[PDB]
Amino acid sequence: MIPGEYHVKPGQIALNTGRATCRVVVENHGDRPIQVGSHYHFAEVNPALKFDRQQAAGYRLNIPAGTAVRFEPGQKREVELVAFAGHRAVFGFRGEVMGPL
């Protein structure tokens, strides 16, 4: 007996189903580490990360909510992106869109 214990049924949860995704190879050209959160507009991340910013427009990382991907200096890796939903309006970040799309 463990007070307040869970009895989670086994299996998995499919995340962000029914949405467009794409894979992008990203490389950290900066000299300091960079970490990106799950809902950040990927196209507006730190300029030191080199990748096809055009393809990443309107996308965010296809990872569980609240997690992140770290890029050590010189690190190269392919990441999977998932498209923003809702109104598909972007405000904030580096201020590159500040509107729909």
Partner: protein, 566 residues
Amino acid sequence: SNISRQAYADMFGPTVGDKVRLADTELWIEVEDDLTTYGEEVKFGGGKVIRDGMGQGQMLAADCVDLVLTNALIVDHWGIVKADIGVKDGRIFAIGKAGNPDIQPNVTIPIGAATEVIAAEGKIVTAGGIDTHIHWICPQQAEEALVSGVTTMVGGGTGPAAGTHATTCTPGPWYISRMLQAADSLPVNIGLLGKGNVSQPDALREQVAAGVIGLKIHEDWGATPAAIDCALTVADEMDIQVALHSDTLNESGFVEDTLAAIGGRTIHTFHTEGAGGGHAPDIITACAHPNILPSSTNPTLPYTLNTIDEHLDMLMVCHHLDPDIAEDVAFAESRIRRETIAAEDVLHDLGAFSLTSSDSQAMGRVGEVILRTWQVAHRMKVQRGALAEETGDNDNFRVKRYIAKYTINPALTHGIAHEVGSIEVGKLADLVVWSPAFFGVKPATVIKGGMIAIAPMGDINASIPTPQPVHYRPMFGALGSARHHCRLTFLSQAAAANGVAERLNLRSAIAVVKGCRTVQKADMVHNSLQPNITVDAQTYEVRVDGELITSEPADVLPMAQRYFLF
């Protein structure tokens, strides 16, 4: 992408199908529904979701909530579901999916710059409890009750005076006025009960016009057919509730005579089992009636090995009885009965008894209403198994039936359900956050009117709020003017119309009671049973439809020695 169910539970709390153990009891709840869109859950923290342009939008204050409880496991009379909770203007705005409509789907609770966040993932959230049997013996009772998870307190008293030690009555205009003023200083919603024992209607009307939301008929002041009729007549015209503690001595008549005096009019019977007071030995038969809203006080809940021994003495100091006077003691055995005490537990499990209450410092424990209600559910599960209404391999229905006993039913009985009593939109945001391991015992956070009023707090000088010693301390929602804005003082319609609030210069928000005369047993949520019950005048055996109703005394109970220092 994909995530395993266990890792998911660890990050955002349990989801549909997952079961959770309530504290150290044998009760298990199962998430019936989840209002989220997997992958779009909102979480706060460094690099998390709730950030500008992401999980937080660009709306103005008017277009977003003031507070959001993220990933909560709601346990209420209407369901056990996973969802975000939005609070706006001190009230429940919505139960749904929170976030930013700009980039996320299905957002019903918008989060903006003006939104504070409470992380509830892994926690159970319930409405604040409502205790309708409070003896205002001392003001310290409010903090004790708030700490246990009770946010509304209805009762009567003037302090440690004989009348109050024995009855829930705030006698007359002057004392009623004084207590209403004092009420502004307490961090719980409050409603007062006047002395209803009089055979002259005007004496009662004055009290209602002064501010009480109900009248207590108590035998110590004379619970006679004349007094009862008078109180009910006034209650019927002023829309206030009547609470009853009948004639234990059978001095003016037996239970059938009292029932006859009531004449089918709506009335809340206090401690219906009788140990707390009432026609010996069959006051319990009252729960069979359509116009009777029955409640239990907590010392007899649940039936344990030490219950009887303890009661024989407790019943002396409360009612000012003399152990040296034969008549003052000889009736003890007629008032404390193993037979009705064992039956009371089953009657709750069947939904015949609809409310639980304390009877604070007058044969009841103010900080144990919630705790004891769950101990009874545990004991009944252990002894009787699944309820006829249960579905699935969980105790979901039993949980909804019992939580209703100290939340929505007390609210309905006293005409305040339009304001408090459950987690429904528009109601005051009186919420309690619980860690599953401490459910019903020690809350993580107690929210009043949308502001945290009390919570466990560690070393004030520490680098974080968690270092020892951790103990409950008053928060901003309990301070001066902020407190006034987050609590309600309930008044009768007549008092509200007479300008009583302005006259006494009451600072807190005011609410008016209504619908006290129209509620009946059928309106009690999940507890509307009207059993054909009888009590043998000689053996004291309780029977429903001829079958004997009884249970066995517990030797050990959950939510006890594992959690308390003393």
